[PDB]
């Protein structure tokens, strides 16, 4: 029924501009205006303003009057956020939310979020390494094995074990940034009957750098 689907996440060096789209589905655009909310990494949720999708008038929160500009491709049921002269402390996630009423006191139905990472760092493609055990039966007849996806910018990265056919007993850890780039890993635990016998592969796509890697975890023991 109602889907607000947002653009994908961008990287932009300080000073640039970004236009984040919010494409609305399921309701009549015109009778429900749009709330733009900023959930900053640590800080929590903040109302950025509301746009009257009927007249087109925006309200900005005082914190947001200035570099921020709401607009709408009415015609296509899109609302957009534009942040000009990007400041480094604008990295965060922005949600368009539908406002139930006049002014948007209620956000029923929120979009997925578009995350911006303001950064002068250059995009780096990752290094994916098959981390196969020097055994030590990791729990009764279970072998744990892993994937270290090192040195990329920016995040996200999509790590699936064997096309996502392996879902049980995966742990993919959050990436961490060491100065300029990211390190991410994921363990998968299979039974001794499933490996080295069956082929476990760690498939890594870094779409910012157009990387898609498939590392077979070779037995190497």
């Amino acid at each position: 029924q109602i889907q607000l689907v947002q653009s994908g996440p961008e990287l932009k060096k300080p000073g640039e501009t970004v236009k984040i789209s919010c494409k609305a589905s399921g309701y009549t655009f015109t009778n429900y205006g749009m709330n733009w909310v900023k959930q900053a990494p640590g800080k929590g949720l903040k109302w950025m303003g509301w746009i009257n999708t009927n007249t087109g008038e925006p309200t900005y929160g005082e914190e947001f009057k200035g570099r921020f500009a709401f607009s709408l491709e009415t015609s296509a049921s899109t609302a957009n956020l534009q942040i000009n002269n990007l400041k480094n402390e604008d990295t965060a996630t922005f949600f368009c939310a539908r406002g139930e009423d006049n002014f948007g006191s209620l956000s029923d139905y929120w979009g997925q979020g578009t995350t911006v990472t303001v950064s002068s760092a250059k995009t780096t493609a990752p290094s994916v390494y098959p981390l196969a055990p020097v055994c030590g039966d990791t729990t009764g007849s279970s072998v744990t094995l892993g994937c270290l996806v090192k040195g990329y910018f920016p995040e996200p990265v999509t790590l699936t074990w064997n096309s996502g056919s392996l879902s049980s007993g995966v742990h993919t850890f959050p990436a961490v940034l060491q100065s300029d780039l990211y390190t991410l890993s994921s363990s998968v635990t299979v039974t001794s009957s499933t490996w080295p016998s069956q082929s476990i592969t760690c498939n890594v796509a870094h779409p910012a750098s157009s990387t898609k890697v498939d590392k077979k975890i070779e037995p190497r023991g």
């Binding site: 290094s127 390494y129 981390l131 990791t138 270290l148 090192k150 190497r220």
Partner: peptide, 25 residues
Amino acid sequence: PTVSIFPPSSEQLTSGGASVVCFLN
């Protein structure tokens, strides 16, 4: 915790780097 330690990957070693990984699941 299910603890598991991991030698440097050989290909990593070719890159001149060595990372020892340890999972506590």
